Amino acid sequence: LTVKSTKQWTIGTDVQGSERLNGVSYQEDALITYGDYQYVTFYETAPAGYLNHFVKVGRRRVSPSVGDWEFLTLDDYTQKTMDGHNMISMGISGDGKIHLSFDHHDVPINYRISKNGIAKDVPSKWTSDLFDPVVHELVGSQGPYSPLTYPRFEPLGNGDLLLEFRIGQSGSGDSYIHRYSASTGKWQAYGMYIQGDDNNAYINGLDYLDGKLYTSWTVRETPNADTNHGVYFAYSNDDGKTWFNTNDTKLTKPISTSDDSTLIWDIPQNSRMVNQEGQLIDTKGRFHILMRDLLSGEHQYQHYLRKADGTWTKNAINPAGLNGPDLYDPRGKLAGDASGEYLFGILPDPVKQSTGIYVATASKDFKDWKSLAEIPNTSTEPLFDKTRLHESGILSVFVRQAGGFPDRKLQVWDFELDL
Ligand SMILES: *[C@@H]1O[C@H](CO)[C@@H](O[C@@H]2O[C@H](CO)[C@@H](O[C@@H]3O[C@H](CO[C@H]4O[C@H](CO[C@H]5O[C@H](CO)[C@@H](O)[C@H](O)[C@@H]5O)[C@@H](O)[C@H](O[C@H]5O[C@H](CO)[C@@H](O)[C@H](O)[C@@H]5O)[C@@H]4O)[C@@H](O)[C@H](O[C@H]4O[C@H](CO)[C@@H](O)[C@H](O)[C@@H]4O)[C@@H]3O)[C@H](O)[C@H]2NC(C)=O)[C@H](O)[C@H]1NC(C)=O
Ligand SMILES: C[C@@H]1O[C@@H](O)[C@H](O)[C@H](O)[C@H]1O
Ligand SMILES: [Ca+2]
Ligand code: NA
Numbered sequence: 001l002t003v004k005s006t007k008q009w010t011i012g013t014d015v016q017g018s019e020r021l022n023g024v025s026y027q028e029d030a031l032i033t034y035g036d037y038q039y040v041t042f043y044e045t046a047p048a049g050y051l052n053h054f055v056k057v058g059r060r061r062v063s064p065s066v067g068d069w070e071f072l073t074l075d076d077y078t079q080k081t082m083d084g085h086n087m088i089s090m091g092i093s094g095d096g097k098i099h100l101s102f103d104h105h106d107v108p109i110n111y112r113i114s115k116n117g118i119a120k121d122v123p124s125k126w127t128s129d130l131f132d133p134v135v136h137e138l139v140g141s142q143g144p145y146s147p148l149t150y151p152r153f154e155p156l157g158n159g160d161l162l163l164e165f166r167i168g169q170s171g172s173g174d175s176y177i178h179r180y181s182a183s184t185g186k187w188q189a190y191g192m193y194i195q196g197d198d199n200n201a202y203i204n205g206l207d208y209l210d211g212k213l214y215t216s217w218t219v220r221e222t223p224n225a226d227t228n229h230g231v232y233f234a235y236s237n238d239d240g241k242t243w244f245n246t247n248d249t250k251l252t253k254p255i256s257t258s259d260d261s262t263l264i265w266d267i268p269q270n271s272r273m274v275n276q277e278g279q280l281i282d283t284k285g286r287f288h289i290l291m292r293d294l295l296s297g298e299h300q301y302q303h304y305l306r307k308a309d310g311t312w313t314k315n316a317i318n319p320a321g322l323n324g325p326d327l328y329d330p331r332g333k334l335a336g337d338a339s340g341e342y343l344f345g346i347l348p349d350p351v352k353q354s355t356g357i358y359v360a361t362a363s364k365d366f367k368d369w370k371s372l373a374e375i376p377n378t379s380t381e382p383l384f385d386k387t388r389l390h391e392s393g394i395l396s397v398f399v400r401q402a403g404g405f406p407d408r409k410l411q412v413w414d415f416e417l418d419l
Contacts, residue, residue, distance in 0.1 A: 001342060001359060003373055004416040011069055011412060012044050015053050016405040019084035023380035023400035023410070025331035026276045027087050028152035028205055031398045031412065033388040034092045034119045036063040040398060041090045041100065042410055046078055053079040055088060055102060059126055062388065070126045077110070077134050079103050089151045094159015094182040096120025100131075106147035106169055108136045138163070140186030141178050150276075154206035154213070156239055158182070162190075162213075164206060164240075171222040173200035174254070177240040190240050195254040202228070202275030204289060209281045212237055216279050216289045216304075219257045221269070225327055228275050231265040231289060231304060246310060264312050265304060271295055272326055278333040283390075284308075284340035284362070290317075290332055292325050299324035301332065301347060305366060319358050319369040323351040331381045337419055338390040345369065346382045346397060353402045355382045357395065357415065375413050377402050393419035 014022055022042045023030075031040050038060050043053040055074045061067035079086065085105040092098050096117025103110050112134045116123075123130065137145055144167050154162040159182035166173045177190040194201045194217070201217040208214070213236040221227040234243045234255060243251045245262050255262060267273055271293040278290035289304035301317040301324065318324070325331075329350035336343055343366055345358040355375040360366040375382075379402040388396045395415040401408045 001372070002418050004418045006373065006413070006415055008411050008413045009069060010409045011040065011058060011071075012042055012056065012410040013406050014400050014408045014410050015043050015045050016050055017082045019082050020379070020381075020400065021053070021084060021087060023383065023398065024084060024087040025278070025333075025381035026150055026152065026205075027383055028089050028154070029386075030088065030090065030383045031385045031396060032090060032092055033062060033385050033391065033396075035122075036061055037119065037122065038062045038385065038388060038396070039090065039092070039098065039119070040412065041088050043079060043088070044073070046075070048078070051080055051082060055079070055100065057090075057098070057100075062392070072126050072128045072130065074112075074128050074131060076128070081105065085149055089153055091153025091155060091161050091163070092119050093155065093161040093180055095185070099153065099161065099163075099180070101151035101153075101163065104148050104151065104165075106149055108146035109138070109148050109151075109165075111135055111138065138178050138180075138187035140184075141189045144176075152203075152206055154208050156208060157211060160239075162206065162240060163187075164203075166200060168196065168200060171200060171220060171227075172196055172198055175201060175203065179239065192254045193240055193243065195256050197256055197258040199257055201232070201257050204277055204279040207279055207281040207287070209283070209285065213240055214279070214281050214287055216287075218267070218273065218275050218291075220275060225274065226272075227269050228271075228273055229267060229269045230263050231267055231291065232262040233264045233287070233289075233306065234262050246306065246312070264306075265314060267293060267295070272299060274327050274331060277331045280334040280336055280343075282336040282340045282343065283338060286340070286362075288334050288343065290334050290345070294326075299326050301325065301345070303366065315367060317345055317347070317358070317369055319371055321371065322347065322356060322358070323349050325350050330379070333382055333384060335384050335386070335389055335395065337393070337417075339419070342419070344372070344395065346384060348378060348380065348382060354378055355380065355397070355399060357397075373415055375399055379408075393417050
């Protein structure tokens with residue numbers, strides 16, 4: 001497996017401040033291909049300057065040929081909170097509508113949707129008038145809508161879209177799911193699916209494949225990040241209403257964080273494992289978790305694999321030259337190709353200030369990690385475009401640079417693989 005071409009585009013100038021607002025691990029998602037177009041979303045500085053930002057949405061044609069980016073600016077909502085939690089997630093439903101949810105740390109929902117199905121009936125002009133106003137509810141559904149953190153979207157097989165988030169606070173919170181119907185244009189409440197017990201679950205993402213929805217998490221006792229413990233797993237066969245553990249045992253609804261039947265690896269507190277890293281369902285149905293810990297005596301990225309035959313294994317990701325991350329270092333992701341044979345680790349290196357792309361293969365039980373490429377000069381939690389990789393064999397990664405304002409740019413890097 002080799003890289004056929006590498007290309008990069010500078011798409012904006014990152015915002016000034018001591019927190020990272022663009023390129024955050026739990027943006028789900030930031031960079032999405034739908035049909036012939038790729039879409040991206042990020043904050044840029046508004047005319048009032050420091051600590052005033054607008055959401056931008058970019059699109060470019062990627063098929064049959066790659067075209068230039070064009071951007072619209074949503075200049076009717078000013079983001080003003082210098083807090084790295086307050087990121088943007090985007091999702092696209094099967095009616096072609098683009099959904100955005102943004103700017104939360106324990107506050108009421110901020111959500112908006114396109115007026116028409118602009119990712120399906122593609123408009124000639126890309127302007128802010130394409131979007132409806134910001135609202136603080138999900139029409140058709142019910143609250144609670146506050147205090148919300150961590151909006152995540154997941155598209156489903158019939159064109160519907162899940163929106164998932166935490167209600168509560170660090171160290172005491174629950175998680176909820178809502179479902180948007182592409183046929184009716186309405187949301188509906190699926191309710192609380194994980195319930196804290198004087199703690200909160202931090203999921204790594206949502207992964208959907210062939211009618212099943214998968215998630216993994218750790219449990220945090222207090223606002224101190226050293227108090228994460230455990231690696232947990234569950235899946236649903238009905239889009240989030242009914243959940244099962246790794247042994248196919250039906251769970252209570254909601255799942256309590258005090259129920260150990262979802263535990264797949266005992267990791268104590270003070271292991272230097274961080275919440276909200278990465279996960280992946282590969283196209284062969286194997287489930288992968290990316291975390292980190294110090295338990296071997298060195299800081300290392302860790303790969304948890306759920307095999308076909310229910311087994312779980314844990315193996316360090318330690319290719320030559322990769323510096324292992326501590327608790328507060330940037331978080332990575334796992335990507336997979338359409339065939340299910342290739343697993344990509346998109347791993348930020350906290351010493352080199354770069355993002356490494358590593359590959360392992362199912363034929364070698366994913367133990368053959370090799371360097372494939374590097375993105376230099378990054379201070380980012382890398383994010384990638386799942387659909388573009390599956391459909392085109394192009395690994396497309398959104399990054400925030402290292403460096404100081406206003407030199408620090410936002411970029412998309414495309415690695416064309418000879419898959
Ligand atoms: C339902 O699903 C669950 C989840 O998959 C499943 O439970 C697993 O069952 C398998 C097989 O029965 C167990 O696998 C064995 O584990 C042996 C010891 O496990 C210990 O270590 C686990 C890993 O943590 C270690 O390392 C981390 C650092 O990475 C560290 O933090 C830990 O302290 C620890 O050192 C750990 O998760 C596990 O903890 C469970 O058990 C303890 C009590 O023992 C409990 O207190 C915990 O809360 C938790 O329940 C435990 O501490 C291991 O020695 C053994 O290896 C032998 O067999 C393999 C064959 O595969 C050989 O390769 C090897 O050479 C040895 O001969 C084997 O790997 C696994 O531990 C269970 N996992 C959990 C979370 O319980 C249930 O069986 C399923 N039930 C049904 C009905 O299907
Ligand atoms: C460790 C800490 O945990 C949560 O508050 C968020 O994920 C944040 O981004 C991370 O820095
Ligand atoms: Ca996802
Ligand atoms: Na608590």
